[PDB]
Enzyme design. Structure first.
Site, PDB file in Angstrom:
ATOM      1  N   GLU B  60     -56.769  20.889 -78.526  1.00 48.33           N
ATOM      2  CA  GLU B  60     -57.376  20.428 -77.373  1.00 48.33           C
ATOM      3  C   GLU B  60     -56.392  20.684 -76.089  1.00 48.33           C
ATOM      4  O   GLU B  60     -56.860  20.910 -75.017  1.00 48.33           O
ATOM      5  CB  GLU B  60     -57.391  18.833 -77.482  1.00 48.33           C
ATOM      6  CG  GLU B  60     -58.177  18.353 -78.699  1.00 48.33           C
ATOM      7  CD  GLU B  60     -57.551  17.965 -79.790  1.00 48.33           C
ATOM      8  OE1 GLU B  60     -56.921  19.163 -80.468  1.00 48.33           O
ATOM      9  OE2 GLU B  60     -57.643  16.926 -80.380  1.00 48.33           O
ATOM     10  N   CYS B  94     -55.731  13.418 -81.395  1.00 50.54           N
ATOM     11  CA  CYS B  94     -54.916  12.447 -81.656  1.00 50.54           C
ATOM     12  C   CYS B  94     -54.480  11.596 -80.540  1.00 50.54           C
ATOM     13  O   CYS B  94     -55.115  11.764 -79.298  1.00 50.54           O
ATOM     14  CB  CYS B  94     -53.535  13.257 -82.149  1.00 50.54           C
ATOM     15  SG  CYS B  94     -52.512  14.297 -80.669  1.00 50.54           S
ATOM     16  N   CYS B  97     -53.490  14.097 -77.312  1.00 54.86           N
ATOM     17  CA  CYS B  97     -54.699  14.576 -76.761  1.00 54.86           C
ATOM     18  C   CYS B  97     -55.483  13.817 -76.158  1.00 54.86           C
ATOM     19  O   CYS B  97     -56.224  14.135 -75.266  1.00 54.86           O
ATOM     20  CB  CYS B  97     -55.330  15.493 -77.917  1.00 54.86           C
ATOM     21  SG  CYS B  97     -54.275  16.764 -78.265  1.00 54.86           S
TER      22      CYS B  97
HETATM   23 ZN   LIG Z   1     -53.682  16.169 -80.609  1.00 56.29          ZN
END
Ligand SMILES: [Zn+2]
Ligand SMILES: [Zn+2]
Lengths: 282, 161
Positions: B60, B94, B97
């Site tokens: 990302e 995550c 991101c």
């Molecule tokens: Zn991430």
């Protein structure tokens, strides 16, 4: 003026639980060293190395007496005699009085609150968190981060500064401030620093760019920066003042979670006086 | 202009899955992702952490930087572009991101499987929709798209480490 406060998970922030143990007064003070040797050979207390075995007491006059920590209490913490607790001939109990129960901190203290609570029951090991030499070094690194934040402010950038330090040599590996712009909005001070450490590292390197290193940042990192530090595996972070959406103390504590594969120490308050006048992150 | 990218969800996630497989073959966490603005790919990325020796180079983050380069080269402001861009990613973003995507004010993420280790759209923390008034805007998610294929890639990778 400043003081370094640890930022622990909510679990480790409460009171340490207490366990029961037997102590006895030392009525003949000149037996102290012998009794300490004999009793601690029988009962080494391996699970409680934070506890000193002799508790001094000053009377309302200055006269000093002492209690000796004998052993942990069993499942039935009843009254016990010296003959019941101390084997002979391994221990010659002469000079001790009648055992009494005392509650002890089960684990060593981490905060100042915990240290005060702990030593109210029994002398415990650590006074203060950082030595004079340590505090001087920490102030020097945070001063460098403040200076980076003020350069950013003078240029019209967000006033956040950061310094990465290898505590093995106390050398600075990176100094950066926020460089975020319309074209590049994610250049927060911590992100800049991580990329600086990355570019200056060897060829046979792991991607855990910050393993072993310390970070000094003027104010508490946002969620993005805080979790970047988890992924990069910073070892300790010192920051000055909190941030409203901060993720190392304020709204989250991502450094102190059981379900992330990396935890690290965080302390707030370092030069907080100056840092609170700088910009929060983000 | 957002729901117009959603029309080709199947094509965009197939490309994301193709990129995820590449990442797997290159000993990277198998996450591929595309950023679509007005039915055109303006950025794409797969995990480049082990390639770059830099733990922050998640798919990302790589894609965000590509869209920013695209905006810079074509003289468009990131605001107008990112606020009408959909991210297609094989794995739940995550915590890190998810925060970057909020700061960029991406309105919508279509993702595949859950991210049990680090997920910031609900698995570990709900960064995506959290009340974070100084951290960009919350975004919405369409989870579960081809989650079975995507999580099989993840498990394959985590066996090989
Ligand atoms: Zn991430
Ligand atoms: Zn940040």
């Amino acid at each position: 003026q400043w003081q370094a406060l640890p930022v622990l998970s909510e679990q480790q922030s409460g009171a340490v639980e207490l366990i029961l143990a037997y102590a006895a007064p030392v009525l003949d003070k000149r037996q102290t060293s012998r009794l300490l040797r004999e009793v601690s050979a029988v009962y080494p207390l391996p699970a409680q190395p934070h506890l000193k075995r002799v508790r001094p007491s000053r009377s309302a006059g200055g006269a000093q007496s002492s209690d000796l920590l004998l052993c942990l209490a069993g499942p039935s913490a009843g009254p016990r005699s010296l003959a019941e607790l101390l084997p002979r001939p391994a221990v010659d109990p002469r000079g001790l009085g009648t055992p009494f129960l005392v509650p002890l901190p089960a684990r060593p203290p981490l905060t100042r609150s915990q240290f005060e609570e702990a030593r109210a029951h029994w002398p415990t090991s650590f006074g203060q968190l950082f030595s004079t030499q340590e505090r001087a070094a920490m102030q020097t690194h945070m001063e460098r981060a403040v200076c980076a934040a003020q350069r950013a402010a003078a240029q019209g950038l967000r006033a956040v500064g950061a310094v990465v330090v290898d505590p093995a040599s106390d050398r600075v590996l990176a100094t950066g401030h926020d460089c975020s712009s319309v074209a590049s909005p994610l250049l927060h001070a911590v992100m800049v620093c991580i990329d600086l450490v990355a570019q200056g590292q060897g060829e046979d390197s792991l991607p855990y760019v910050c393993t072993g290193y310390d970070l000094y940042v003027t104010r508490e990192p946002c969620v993005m920066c805080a979790m970047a530090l988890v992924h990069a595996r910073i070892q300790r972070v010192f920051y000055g003042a909190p941030s409203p959406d901060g993720a190392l103390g304020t709204l989250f504590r991502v450094h102190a979670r059981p379900d992330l594969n990396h935890r690290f120490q965080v302390f707030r308050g370092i030069l907080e006086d100056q840092c609170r006048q700088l910009d929060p992150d983000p | 202009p957002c729901v117009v990218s959603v029309q080709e969800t199947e094509k965009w996630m197939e490309e994301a899955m193709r990129m995820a497989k590449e990442a797997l073959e290159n000993i990277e966490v198998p996450v591929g992702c595309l950023m679509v603005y007005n039915n055109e790919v303006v950025g794409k990325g797969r995990n480049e952490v082990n390639q770059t020796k830099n733990a922050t180079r998640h798919a990302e983050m790589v894609a965000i930087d590509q869209v920013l380069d695209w905006c810079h080269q074509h003289g468009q402001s990131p605001s107008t572009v990112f606020e009408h861009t959909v991210l297609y990613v094989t794995v739940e973003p995550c915590i890190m991101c998810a925060a970057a995507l909020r700061l960029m004010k991406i309105p919508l993420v279509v993702y595949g499987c859950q991210n049990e280790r680090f997920g910031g759209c609900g698995s570990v923390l709900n960064i995506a929709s959290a009340d974070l008034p100084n951290t960009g805007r919350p975004f919405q998610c369409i989870p579960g798209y081809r989650a079975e294929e995507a999580v099989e890639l993840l498990k394959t990778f985590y066996k090989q480490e």
